[PDB]
Write a protein that binds this ligand. Sequence first.
Ligand SMILES: CC1=C\[C@@H](O)CC(=O)Cc2nc(co2)C(=O)N2CCC=C2C(=O)O[C@H](C(C)C)[C@H](C)/C=C/C(=O)NC\C=C\1
Ligand SMILES: [Cl-]
Ligand SMILES: [Cl-]
Ligand SMILES: [Cl-]
Ligand SMILES: [Cl-]
Ligand SMILES: [Mg+2]
Ligand SMILES: [Mg+2]
Ligand SMILES: [Mg+2]
Ligand SMILES: [Mg+2]
Ligand SMILES: [Mg+2]
Ligand SMILES: [Mg+2]
Ligand SMILES: [Mg+2]
Ligand SMILES: [Mg+2]
Ligand SMILES: [Mg+2]
Ligand SMILES: [Mg+2]
Ligand SMILES: [Mg+2]
Ligand SMILES: [Mg+2]
Ligand SMILES: [Mg+2]
Ligand SMILES: [Mg+2]
Ligand SMILES: [Mg+2]
Ligand SMILES: [Mg+2]
Ligand SMILES: [Mg+2]
Ligand SMILES: [Mg+2]
Ligand SMILES: [Mg+2]
Ligand SMILES: [Mg+2]
Ligand SMILES: [Mg+2]
Ligand SMILES: [Mg+2]
Ligand SMILES: [Mg+2]
Ligand SMILES: [Mg+2]
Ligand SMILES: [Mg+2]
Ligand SMILES: [Mg+2]
Ligand SMILES: [Mg+2]
Ligand SMILES: [Mg+2]
Ligand SMILES: [Mg+2]
Ligand SMILES: [Mg+2]
Ligand SMILES: [Mg+2]
Ligand SMILES: [Mg+2]
Ligand SMILES: [Mg+2]
Ligand SMILES: [Mg+2]
Ligand SMILES: [Mg+2]
Ligand SMILES: [Mg+2]
Ligand SMILES: [Mg+2]
Ligand SMILES: [Mg+2]
Ligand SMILES: [Mg+2]
Ligand SMILES: [Mg+2]
Ligand SMILES: [Mg+2]
Ligand SMILES: [Mg+2]
Ligand SMILES: [Mg+2]
Ligand SMILES: [Mg+2]
Ligand SMILES: [Mg+2]
Ligand SMILES: [Mg+2]
Ligand SMILES: [Mg+2]
Ligand SMILES: [Mg+2]
Ligand SMILES: [Mg+2]
Ligand SMILES: [Mg+2]
Ligand SMILES: [Mg+2]
Ligand SMILES: [Mg+2]
Ligand SMILES: [Mg+2]
Ligand SMILES: [Mg+2]
Ligand SMILES: [Mg+2]
Ligand SMILES: [Mg+2]
Ligand SMILES: [Mg+2]
Ligand SMILES: [Mg+2]
Ligand SMILES: [Mg+2]
Ligand SMILES: [Mg+2]
Ligand SMILES: [Mg+2]
Ligand SMILES: [Mg+2]
Ligand SMILES: [Mg+2]
Ligand SMILES: [Mg+2]
Ligand SMILES: [Mg+2]
Ligand SMILES: [Mg+2]
Ligand SMILES: [Mg+2]
Ligand SMILES: [Mg+2]
Ligand code: NA
Ligand code: NA
Ligand code: NA
Ligand code: NA
Ligand code: NA
Ligand code: NA
Ligand code: NA
Ligand code: NA
Ligand code: NA
Ligand code: NA
Ligand code: NA
Ligand code: NA
Ligand code: NA
Ligand code: NA
Ligand code: NA
Ligand code: NA
Ligand code: NA
Ligand code: NA
Ligand code: NA
Ligand code: NA
Ligand code: NA
Ligand code: NA
Ligand code: NA
Ligand code: NA
Ligand code: NA
Ligand code: NA
Lengths: 237, 7
Amino acid sequence: GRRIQGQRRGRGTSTFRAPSHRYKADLEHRKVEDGDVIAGTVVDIEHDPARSAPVAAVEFEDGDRRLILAPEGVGVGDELQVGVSAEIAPGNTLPLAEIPEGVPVCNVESSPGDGGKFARASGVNAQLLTHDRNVAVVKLPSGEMKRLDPQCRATIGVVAGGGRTDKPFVKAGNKHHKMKARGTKWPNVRGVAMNAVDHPFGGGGRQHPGKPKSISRNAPPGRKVGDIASKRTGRGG
Amino acid sequence: XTXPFXX
RNA sequence: GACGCGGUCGAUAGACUCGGGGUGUGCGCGUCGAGGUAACGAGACGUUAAGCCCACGAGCACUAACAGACCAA
RNA sequence: UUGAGGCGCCCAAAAUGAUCGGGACUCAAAUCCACCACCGAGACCUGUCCGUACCACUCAUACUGGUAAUCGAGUAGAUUGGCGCUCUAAUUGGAUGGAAGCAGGGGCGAGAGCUCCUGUGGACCGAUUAGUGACGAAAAUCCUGGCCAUAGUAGCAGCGAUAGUCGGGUGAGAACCCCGACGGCCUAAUGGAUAAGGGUUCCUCAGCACUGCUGAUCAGCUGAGGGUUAGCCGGUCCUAAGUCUCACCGCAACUCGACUGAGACGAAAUGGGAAACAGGUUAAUAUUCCUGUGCCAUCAUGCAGUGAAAGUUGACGCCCUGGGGUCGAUCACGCCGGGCAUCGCCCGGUCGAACCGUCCAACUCCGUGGAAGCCGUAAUGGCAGGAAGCGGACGAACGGCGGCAUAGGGAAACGUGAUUCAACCUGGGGCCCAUGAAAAGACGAGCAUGAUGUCCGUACCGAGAACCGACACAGGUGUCCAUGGCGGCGAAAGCCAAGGCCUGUCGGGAGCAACCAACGUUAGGGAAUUCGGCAAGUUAGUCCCGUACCUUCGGAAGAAGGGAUGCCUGCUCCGGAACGGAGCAGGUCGCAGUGACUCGGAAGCUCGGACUGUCUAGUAACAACAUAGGUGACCGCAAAUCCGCAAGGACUCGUACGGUCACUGAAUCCUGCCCAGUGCAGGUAUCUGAACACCUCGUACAAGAGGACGAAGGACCUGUCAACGGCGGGGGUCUUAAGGUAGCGUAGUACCUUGCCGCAUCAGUAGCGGCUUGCAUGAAUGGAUUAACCAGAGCUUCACUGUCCCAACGUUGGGCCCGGUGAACUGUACAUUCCAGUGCGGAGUCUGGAGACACCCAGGGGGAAGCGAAGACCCUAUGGAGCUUUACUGCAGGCUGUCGCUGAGGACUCUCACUCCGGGAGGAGGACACCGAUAGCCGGGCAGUUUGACUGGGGCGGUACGCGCUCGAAAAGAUAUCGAGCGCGCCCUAUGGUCAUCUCAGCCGGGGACCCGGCGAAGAGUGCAAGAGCAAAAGAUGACUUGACAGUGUUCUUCCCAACGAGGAACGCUGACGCGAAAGCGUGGUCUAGCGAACCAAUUAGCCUGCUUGAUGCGGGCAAUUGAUGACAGAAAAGCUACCCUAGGGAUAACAGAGUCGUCACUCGCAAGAGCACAUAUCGACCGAGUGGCUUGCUACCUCGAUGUCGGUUCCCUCCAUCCUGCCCGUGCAGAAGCGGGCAAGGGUGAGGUUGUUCGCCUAUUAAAGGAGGUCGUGAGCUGGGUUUAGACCGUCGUGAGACAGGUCGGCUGCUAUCUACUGGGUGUGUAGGUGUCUGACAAGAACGACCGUAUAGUACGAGAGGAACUACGGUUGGUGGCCACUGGUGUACCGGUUGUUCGAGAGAGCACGUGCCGGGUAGCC
RNA sequence: CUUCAAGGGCGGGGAGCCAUGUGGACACGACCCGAAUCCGGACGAUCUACGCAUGGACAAGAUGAAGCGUGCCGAAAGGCACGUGGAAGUCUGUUAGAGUUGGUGUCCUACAAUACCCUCUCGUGAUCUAUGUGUAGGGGUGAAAGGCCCAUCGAGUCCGGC
Ligand SMILES: CC1=C\[C@@H](O)CC(=O)Cc2nc(co2)C(=O)N2CCC=C2C(=O)O[C@H](C(C)C)[C@H](C)/C=C/C(=O)NC\C=C\1
Ligand SMILES: [Cl-]
Ligand SMILES: [Cl-]
Ligand SMILES: [Cl-]
Ligand SMILES: [Cl-]
Ligand SMILES: [Mg+2]
Ligand SMILES: [Mg+2]
Ligand SMILES: [Mg+2]
Ligand SMILES: [Mg+2]
Ligand SMILES: [Mg+2]
Ligand SMILES: [Mg+2]
Ligand SMILES: [Mg+2]
Ligand SMILES: [Mg+2]
Ligand SMILES: [Mg+2]
Ligand SMILES: [Mg+2]
Ligand SMILES: [Mg+2]
Ligand SMILES: [Mg+2]
Ligand SMILES: [Mg+2]
Ligand SMILES: [Mg+2]
Ligand SMILES: [Mg+2]
Ligand SMILES: [Mg+2]
Ligand SMILES: [Mg+2]
Ligand SMILES: [Mg+2]
Ligand SMILES: [Mg+2]
Ligand SMILES: [Mg+2]
Ligand SMILES: [Mg+2]
Ligand SMILES: [Mg+2]
Ligand SMILES: [Mg+2]
Ligand SMILES: [Mg+2]
Ligand SMILES: [Mg+2]
Ligand SMILES: [Mg+2]
Ligand SMILES: [Mg+2]
Ligand SMILES: [Mg+2]
Ligand SMILES: [Mg+2]
Ligand SMILES: [Mg+2]
Ligand SMILES: [Mg+2]
Ligand SMILES: [Mg+2]
Ligand SMILES: [Mg+2]
Ligand SMILES: [Mg+2]
Ligand SMILES: [Mg+2]
Ligand SMILES: [Mg+2]
Ligand SMILES: [Mg+2]
Ligand SMILES: [Mg+2]
Ligand SMILES: [Mg+2]
Ligand SMILES: [Mg+2]
Ligand SMILES: [Mg+2]
Ligand SMILES: [Mg+2]
Ligand SMILES: [Mg+2]
Ligand SMILES: [Mg+2]
Ligand SMILES: [Mg+2]
Ligand SMILES: [Mg+2]
Ligand SMILES: [Mg+2]
Ligand SMILES: [Mg+2]
Ligand SMILES: [Mg+2]
Ligand SMILES: [Mg+2]
Ligand SMILES: [Mg+2]
Ligand SMILES: [Mg+2]
Ligand SMILES: [Mg+2]
Ligand SMILES: [Mg+2]
Ligand SMILES: [Mg+2]
Ligand SMILES: [Mg+2]
Ligand SMILES: [Mg+2]
Ligand SMILES: [Mg+2]
Ligand SMILES: [Mg+2]
Ligand SMILES: [Mg+2]
Ligand SMILES: [Mg+2]
Ligand SMILES: [Mg+2]
Ligand SMILES: [Mg+2]
Ligand SMILES: [Mg+2]
Ligand SMILES: [Mg+2]
Ligand SMILES: [Mg+2]
Ligand SMILES: [Mg+2]
Ligand SMILES: [Mg+2]
Ligand code: NA
Ligand code: NA
Ligand code: NA
Ligand code: NA
Ligand code: NA
Ligand code: NA
Ligand code: NA
Ligand code: NA
Ligand code: NA
Ligand code: NA
Ligand code: NA
Ligand code: NA
Ligand code: NA
Ligand code: NA
Ligand code: NA
Ligand code: NA
Ligand code: NA
Ligand code: NA
Ligand code: NA
Ligand code: NA
Ligand code: NA
Ligand code: NA
Ligand code: NA
Ligand code: NA
Ligand code: NA
Ligand code: NA
């Protein structure tokens, strides 16, 4: 047969790449020798093409201009702070240690100083729960309990743009426009609609998968399709 | 090759 | 290709004129014309069975059937 | 009276024209019995010759003589002598007193071939002998070249662009080169400017050999000259997606490869961007040259300035909209010029840049002001956080204004105002799960004067002749001109300017026929056509009125239906106004007022997919794909998923409201049960589970053997179906987990099936509704339902109509004749055929007859199993490829243990390698992970392959695939079939061996046990088929025994003859044994079935042997036993292909033919029986005999280098077994109406509804509405609905690819006629100069067929009911031939009305496709 | 040689070697042509598919979503009317442009190796389009038809293995 679509993906051709050259900023937390002296003022609220959520343009005392992962509430004029001593209000960023338990946080770091990794999608937010001299348990938006180094920096508040998922796309055109600004090939042709040569589900005089859909984790690329290492399927039971 | 000559 | 007819001792074809037909009342001018100060005015009547037109007929030698070539026991 | 024989007769029906080969034959030219004489082969006899064989002579195979009654045909093939070609050598010759070759001719040889003569030619050429070899052609759809027919043929017509004509000019020559006039064509192009691309095609002169669809004096052609001028137009510069280079790293390596870093490259219309305008000029350039004016940059000098870098700009999406405003267009009036001539109208012009200066609306802001309800907009909106008003700062045009300009341009005038306003300028609003470049540069930042401003491009085309498409190709190919006039909603039609063209480049002629392409009009009927209304038509613009079911409330909807519509006169209303819009009153014309043009036919039921969208470039546009929506899966990012060999990379400037991987496919109501199998996942006492290390044995070591431990994985357990899938049989549980819930249902799923009932129609395999037992519906393999949408499938109605009845006339281009140009397909030969026959069974050529004078023109295509394409179907090949999978074997990849990196103190701590986060400090992690190596598991993701043979084709089935018996088998042996009957793949320690004793089945008699007697050659028994053998035994009983022994042979068999292995058997020997008195018997079972190679292993006894040598270990070998290949003389082995491919086959199937005729159709013989009695009016069983060649089947002869399917249609001929019609016979014949039969093929046998159907069912008519043959007549005639390609759906089956003798939607029909054939037309020759008139051998016809009515007659007959005929009349129908007074059609002759536009109006005209439309219509043709 | 033994197998009383011609066999291209393959290295995204960058294009008309306004009604919520507004993978449309349903027409040695005419669909968007640019052969690209990757596709083309 021929390589399946998932295999064409990896090659990184234009079709599968994201329009990076059209992206505004690689949102990442600022650095500070220490102290926390850093602070700036929101100048504008822009649209971020890579996340379909707003990003805030901020100006710091050291005249540094950078875009930030805008939580909800932040407006132009507002002043934000970054450091071990920053205030405990929405928009400010400080290590999990200096953050009071029970406070919604976003754009959490996985490794202190990595600039943020977790919870940075529209409306989501993490939840700092347990403190310690070593571990800072945080509940990520997926429900998992992530144990983290208390030195990992994070932003207070929930990410802006919440509720985006509530309104349906309604029409293909709308999807089309969104998909065009992402690293994704769209629309999607069903495997079962292809020829055997093209996909393990292809072929037949009627459309149905050849074998069962749940595939072993050990399956090789070219054959891993359908329900990957499913612990279960269906809704029942 | 498509039925009648040469459809 | 063939076939048929006429060729001045002629009506074969055209012109002209009739006859026989098709349309449907010409241009112009006169009167009327709702009105409009007037300018103007769609249209109506008359002149006008008008004007225009005919692959048919007739009359009619005016024009063209001239000149003349060839084959043949 | 009866028996027998001979010849004949009846029985006796077939398709183009009858037959014994034909003629024809009757006391024969038949038949039978005899006889006589002839004809007639290459046989037979005979003369001569030749070859071959043999004999005599001979060196000879040289002569000579002899023999052949017992020699003379031959494909494949074996054997042998010879001819010819090239060049070498030896020997030896010829040629300018004419070599070779070639042409024609003479001679020899059976022949390959040799030789001579004449001519041509003009320089080489042989012979003999021995050699040499790219040495001999009729063939290969052979190769290359040349050439004939084809043929003076097709094309130079078809396109919404139909284009020309008369004069004249030049010229040797003019339809097409040029001038004028007249007439046309193009209007987003046929005009203007350009990008790419071409590359000189541009201009001039000179030409016509080439090119130009004809010609050419012309030319994009040929030749020669010439032509492209830039500070201010492009390039150049900048950066975009992205590319390259260098470094680094990888790789065996590189011209390879990802990242990172630096550098460079990357935009000529169409990204950003310092600066140029006007006029003039050449044959050809032009913002480039020239004249005038202007501008930019840099630099130098001088003055100014010390500011100077923050900021602005470059610089930005989609939708709506306001304001400013130029050109253009139009209106008004003035001036200049032209046009027209009934009027007073109509056309053109009325110019003037860059630049310099100046003006500023919008936006923003400031002061004042002080709104509590006001201000404002097209709209949104604004405000005590300060509204309006007033004043002010900032601030626009490619715009206004002044200059530029006693510049330029114009023959002249050399205007002024207005409206609507492209460009350009500047605002307001709305949308995004979409956020709409960057950099150079510029501004910020003065002025004078001077200097410099190089390099590259510049011609022309830009297309129905300069580009791509082989072409001067009807194709393809980007940008700007979108504001020329009328028209109108319009960048629409139609008409017309400016500009361009008559080069979508061959012409001339015939009322110009048939036929064809496009098209107009057709009376009455109105879908009867057809698979189907295909094609065509109807409708139509605008306003008013009015509008159903259903619905997701959006829609449906322009539903439907109804009315109006022009011109002229005078007006009203809206608005600032328009040369804008809406109305009113009166008048008035036509058949018609959206008058042409432009311009929907409407309604309903059902299926499918929700919708817009996608797709098979080039037969599928669809129900298929997509989609939003629904759902499940994986993953916390050092992730999941994916790419790379590696270095590395996509996702990712991303982070669960994410993105990956899949399924379903809008909404609405819903989505039952099953975890047994398979999959995935989790768990797991126990079991299983590799390698390293470890223990034991072994080996001075090692190989090797065993053990212990045991990872993932498996067993086992659990979870899971919106995971693959499943949802029955039986009874009032069984398989295998459950056993079909809501729904839906004869379905695009239902075989039966045209299911049944209903609707609808005259009639409805259709359609719809209901029922529904569902061959074989059913829930995200989604079920049901559903508004809207649709070049989707089916059906109904109104309307419409040449689809049809049934065809006609017309129009345009061809066709036909002429001038010019000028192919191709195809060709073994011969060829005037026709009817029959025969033949490899489908003949122009064979056989018999018939017909036939030659040549030519036109036609429509019957035949040449026509041309074209080495059949796609089917089979075959130890062919190919794509695809699948629990086929065979492997390879990646994933998981897992182990070793190395790797370090300190069965679980644990640590830091120092190593990894990651962090700019760094330093944080996390940590001997793990990564990486290298290895082991186990999973592993169609990928690779290579296999997947047999036989066979009345193949497949399925079977195995006649290794063996044995009877029969077939034809009295030796041998002998086939998917021939008939049936067996073997073992069993037995005795069921073997010997010896002794003995005789069995069955029956009879005496006391199904046992005992006694008799009969009893064999029917018993002997392991198992069958056939055969056996009686003091080969059987039974008893006893004893292990010969079922080791070794080695002979022979037969396997395999007749006749080679071939294993296996088998018969019969010996040697050795050792058993039994018996002994002879002797025992080489398994009475005989014929019970079987297996090499390699390798194990095993038995002895021996040989391993690389200088000894010892030990472990090997190699001689002989033999056991282990299986049943496809049985031995491969280790699954499928699909409709996506297909190749080699072939008529060695083999499908169609058709051919043979057959069981089947089918029809008949005959006999005649039981019934028919109230009566076989025979009528019906007619059994059985028996046949005919046909329509059905079906069989066969495998013909065709696979192609004989096109079914049905239909059209057009022609035929058969008779006759449906009607004519003439008849019988009757259970009163009549009338029937029934059965005979002769008979002249004519007729029709129209419709369902279905692709043939068939058939049904309706109404009818004299009747017969059947069959012609390659199931007819595709170089049509059609294409079904079968039968590629797309898709449903059901069933399959793990899957995919399948179906199931259904369903869609799905390209090639070719110029050489021959023959016929229909018509000519030219010749024959009869042997003429005119006119005839004859008639023969030939053709259906030229006529049939029905209804009246009189006969309410009569004959009949109780009545009912109800004939002969004959004579009238008419109808079908067919036929002709004709046009009449009716009707046409009538792009003609005349009229009228719309739009153009010629100023008027008059009179052109165009609107070959008439704008409407009305009428002559002749002719019908 | 096998062998207690016996019986078997093979060999034995001197003819070969070389050369030249020739018959035949085996490997090789193996008498000649004949086909679908398979493999290697290269050349192609001037066609076309999909993406990206930078530009361009869409007469005219219809329908009239939200939002806003005015008026009426209401205590309010809010309702109704009219207007304004101008939304839409919206409608009509040969605007330009794109597409390709039927005629199973014309053509079918064509004008054309996919054309012509009429008919027909879309035509503000998942739109069309120019130029530049990326992806390469068991690989791309694919709203999936085994479609397309220069008249070439169930594995392009060229040359080589041959
Ligand atoms: C015209 C022709 C051959 C003739 O010169 C010779 C014949 O008449 C003999 C014949 N041919 C036939 C039956 O007898 C016959 O049925 N042929 C010819 C008509 C369709 C199929 C045929 O195979 O269709 C099959 C289906 C049955 C699956 C598929 C579609 C194959 C088609 C194919 O390869 N066509 C080639 C054409 C061959
Ligand atoms: Cl999304
Ligand atoms: Cl000889
Ligand atoms: Cl240029
Ligand atoms: Cl505004
Ligand atoms: Mg993309
Ligand atoms: Mg990031
Ligand atoms: Mg999909
Ligand atoms: Mg498919
Ligand atoms: Mg596969
Ligand atoms: Mg499906
Ligand atoms: Mg499915
Ligand atoms: Mg085919
Ligand atoms: Mg002989
Ligand atoms: Mg000699
Ligand atoms: Mg030969
Ligand atoms: Mg000819
Ligand atoms: Mg014309
Ligand atoms: Mg020229
Ligand atoms: Mg000249
Ligand atoms: Mg550059
Ligand atoms: Mg530019
Ligand atoms: Mg020029
Ligand atoms: Mg030029
Ligand atoms: Mg031309
Ligand atoms: Mg009619
Ligand atoms: Mg009908
Ligand atoms: Mg019919
Ligand atoms: Mg139609
Ligand atoms: Mg007014
Ligand atoms: Mg009309
Ligand atoms: Mg149906
Ligand atoms: Mg659809
Ligand atoms: Mg197609
Ligand atoms: Mg379609
Ligand atoms: Mg199509
Ligand atoms: Mg979805
Ligand atoms: Mg679908
Ligand atoms: Mg029904
Ligand atoms: Mg379910
Ligand atoms: Mg034929
Ligand atoms: Mg063949
Ligand atoms: Mg096949
Ligand atoms: Mg194969
Ligand atoms: Mg790193
Ligand atoms: Mg495979
Ligand atoms: Mg191989
Ligand atoms: Mg076979
Ligand atoms: Mg015998
Ligand atoms: Mg014996
Ligand atoms: Mg073996
Ligand atoms: Mg053994
Ligand atoms: Mg065998
Ligand atoms: Mg055998
Ligand atoms: Mg083939
Ligand atoms: Mg045969
Ligand atoms: Mg008869
Ligand atoms: Mg007859
Ligand atoms: Mg037929
Ligand atoms: Mg017939
Ligand atoms: Mg035919
Ligand atoms: Mg045909
Ligand atoms: Mg033809
Ligand atoms: Mg069909
Ligand atoms: Mg059909
Ligand atoms: Mg069909
Ligand atoms: Mg003669
Ligand atoms: Mg006209
Ligand atoms: Mg390109
Ligand atoms: Mg409105
Ligand atoms: Mg639309
Ligand atoms: Mg439209
Ligand atoms: Mg397919
Ligand atoms: Na499938
Ligand atoms: Na021979
Ligand atoms: Na010409
Ligand atoms: Na100005
Ligand atoms: Na649309
Ligand atoms: Na569509
Ligand atoms: Na299960
Ligand atoms: Na399970
Ligand atoms: Na089911
Ligand atoms: Na007609
Ligand atoms: Na013919
Ligand atoms: Na294939
Ligand atoms: Na095999
Ligand atoms: Na043997
Ligand atoms: Na018969
Ligand atoms: Na037919
Ligand atoms: Na008859
Ligand atoms: Na036939
Ligand atoms: Na047919
Ligand atoms: Na055809
Ligand atoms: Na191969
Ligand atoms: Na390309
Ligand atoms: Na409103
Ligand atoms: Na079309
Ligand atoms: Na390939
Ligand atoms: Na090759």
